[PDB]
């Protein structure tokens, strides 16, 4: 009715190794699915990538409900991001925050929508989340992209 429901998941067969993400966008009683596999990446990077990819696909300012079970995204969002930004995206040793490339991308896109986060625990009772996992793993088996921001 104006809202966008987004479901995300990302994973790695071996870590670091081939990985992929799955994202489901529900905008106007029309589901949209996004999936891709990368030759060599990490778990944390795919979980972040899924959410980036989905927000970036909205070609307009929306009221979004984003559902993910990623502890990494959750912790960054609720606890670390505000401070990293105050600190110029570096840690106390003055090195760039890990996966800064991805974190900046997410921050930018979170700036363009009104987001409501749904932090999910477990696949049971969350069919869209499970499905993202299936997509994630299937992409990872036929990796086609390079994760060029990966160190």
């Amino acid at each position: 009715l104006k809202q966008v429901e987004i479901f995300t998941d990302g994973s790695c067969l071996g870590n670091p190794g081939p990985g992929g993400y799955g994202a489901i966008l529900r905008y106007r009683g029309r589901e949209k699915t996004f999936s891709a596999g990368y030759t060599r990446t990490t778990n944390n990077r795919m979980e972040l990538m899924a959410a980036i990819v989905a927000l970036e696909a909205l070609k307009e300012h929306c009221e979004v409900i984003l559902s993910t079970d990623s502890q990494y995204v959750r912790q960054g969002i609720t606890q670390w991001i505000h401070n990293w930004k105050k600190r110029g995206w570096k840690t106390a040793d003055k090195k760039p925050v890990k996966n800064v490339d991805l974190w900046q991308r997410l921050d930018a896109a979170l700036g363009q929508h009104q987001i409501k986060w749904e932090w999910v625990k477990g696949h049971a009772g969350h069919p869209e989340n499970e499905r993202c996992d299936e997509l994630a793993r299937a992409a990872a088996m036929n990796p086609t992209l390079e994760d060029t921001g990966y160190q």
Side-chain angles (χ1 to χ4, degrees):
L1 172 56
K2 178 161 34 58
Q3 313 207 174
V4 171
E5 286 175 89
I6 300 181
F7 301 90
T8 65
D9 204 354
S11 87
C12 261
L13 265 347
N15 178 203
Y21 61 80
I24 293 160
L25 209 159
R26 296 212 177 101
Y27 171 95
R28 150 273 290 134
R30 190 271 183 87
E31 286 192 349
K32 261 177 185 323
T33 300
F34 305 91
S35 208
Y38 291 78
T39 61
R40 179 158 165 88
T41 188
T42 74
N43 237 260
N44 285 172
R45 298 186 58 82
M46 283 301 94
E47 282 176 6
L48 202 45
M49 193 66 87
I52 282 158
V53 164
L55 291 175
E56 291 185 343
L58 298 181
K59 282 185 215 132
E60 56 178 6
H61 281 34
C62 309
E63 295 181 16
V64 180
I65 312 157
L66 196 162
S67 177
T68 185
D69 67 356
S70 165
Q71 162 193 260
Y72 186 61
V73 168
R74 178 169 183 160
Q75 290 313 295
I77 296 288
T78 68
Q79 324 292 141
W80 316 138
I81 193 107
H82 70 116
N83 287 139
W84 288 331
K85 281 203 309 220
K86 291 177 179 185
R87 293 152 196 190
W89 294 95
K90 287 163 164 167
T91 40
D93 57 356
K94 292 291 167 155
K95 336 209 44 214
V97 156
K98 191 58 132 121
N99 305 132
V100 64
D101 62 312
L102 299 192
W103 282 118
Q104 300 188 135
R105 270 186 78 174
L106 185 61
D107 178 72
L110 228 55
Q112 307 304 141
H113 302 288
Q114 316 156 225
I115 311 195
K116 171 165 77 144
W117 296 89
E118 172 180 21
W119 312 118
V120 167
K121 31 268 178 301
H123 275 164
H126 299 107
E128 292 88 349
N129 296 99
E130 205 160 340
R131 198 155 141 230
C132 284
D133 186 54
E134 311 203 11
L135 287 158
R137 299 178 320 198
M141 305 193 215
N142 197 194
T144 293
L145 300 76
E146 268 66 280
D147 182 2
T148 34
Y150 170 62
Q151 21 302 136

